[PDB]
Amino acid sequence: QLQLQESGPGLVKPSETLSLTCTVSGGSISSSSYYWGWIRQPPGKGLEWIGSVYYSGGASYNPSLKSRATISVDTSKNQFSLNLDSVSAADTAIYYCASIYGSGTFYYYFYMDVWGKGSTVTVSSASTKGPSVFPLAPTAALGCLVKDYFPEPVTVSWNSGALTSGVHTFPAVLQSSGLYSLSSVVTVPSSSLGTQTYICNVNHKPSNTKVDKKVEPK
């Protein structure tokens, strides 16, 4: 099974350049029936196709971004990368790399077979800041407060992924300080409060921070 994984910086300063790399796994990038492309999704907007390349090197871009975007492929490393020059604030989006399957007798008929996970790219001159995790001590509810981090995103797990039911990870909110604040809670029965232990696995990739906070009552 094909599986694509993005690997970008997450934060790029204005007027600088953005570089993301998409590594294909479970299958060779040097296949006749596949094109490899990039699609970005701005906050609260639709999907915008940036470009696409063939394993030989045949590039193809969207007219608006053709002046900036340059997508290259690396057969020896089994990956393809996007380079968007002169990045601006309007390019803050979630960049998805996708696998475009093509089959055809006369010309290829395309549909984007497999998609990537997505990279939250934020175009800002502000510096990176790691988060601070605080417990929300307590059917009773308990959670964690991930305050003062930049940029997005933050992924919060519970009990190393074992606890999943009834977990609500709220969307981040930008404070007046320019930093984001996130909250993730879970509703568990009151009887299990004393017996079972609860930990939230907060992870902030842009700052390379992984915090395992233990939430206890009182």
Binding site: G46, Y96, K117, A137, A141, P171, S183
Partner: protein
């Protein structure tokens, strides 16, 4: 030229047959595909070549169309089919996605479970205090939360965040965080958040002291 997708938003109860339309910029010349993008995750195609569906996609999804007009139909809606649906078109060496159709589920009016959390001792030691008011699984999305410090309304120093509709019980969840300095937090004792919801006959308020 112009690629449209109607309707923009949608709200239909579980079990309803809902159809969506897509209008390509030109007459179809390559495969038309349909993608399902749940909130947060990446798009996943369900239907390719207007009619065919990918292996593993449930039988309830279907599609048809010809020329410049196309349709996307689901026979029996289920709670995890809530997503923004896009239609893909490949013309003139360009992959163009439709505006998208946000579909929501109509649910029976549910009452929120209100929880109030005091600021942790670690945060108070740093010099700031944040008190959170949690609203668990309430329909519809419209709800009003007001902070009252010592039975006095507060404004400006609190911001809220609502989750996307659930995939199991189809309910929203809210979280408002009131932030004050450690000096201002020591000046008062009672902190409460009033929850005003249409599925709540009395404005439920939860408080604490110290």
């Amino acid at each position: 030229i112009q690629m449209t997708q109607s309707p923009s938003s949608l709200s239909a109860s579980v079990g309803d047959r809902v159809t969506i339309t897509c209008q390509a910029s030109q007459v179809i010349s390559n495969y038309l595909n349909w993608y399902q993008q749940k909130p947060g995750k990446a798009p996943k195609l369900l239907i390719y070549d207007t009619s065919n569906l990918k292996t593993g996609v449930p039988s309830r999804f279907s599609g048809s169309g010809s020329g410049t007009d196309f349709t996307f139909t689901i026979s029996s809606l289920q709670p995890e089919d809530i997503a923004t649906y896009y239609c893909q078109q490949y013309e003139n060496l360009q992959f163009t996605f439709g505006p998208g159709t946000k579909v929501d589920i109509k649910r029976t009016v549910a009452a929120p479970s209100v929880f109030i959390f005091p600021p942790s001792d670690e945060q108070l030691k740093s010099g700031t205090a944040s008190v959170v008011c949690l609203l668990n699984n309430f329909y519809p999305r419209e709800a009003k939360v007001q902070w009252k410090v010592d039975n006095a309304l507060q404004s400006g120093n609190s911001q809220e965040s609502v989750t996307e509709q659930d995939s199991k019980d189809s309910t929203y969840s809210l979280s408002s965080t009131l932030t004050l300095s450690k000096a201002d937090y020591e000046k008062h004792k009672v902190y409460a958040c009033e929850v005003t919801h249409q599925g709540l006959r009395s404005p439920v308020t939860k408080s604490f002291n110290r």
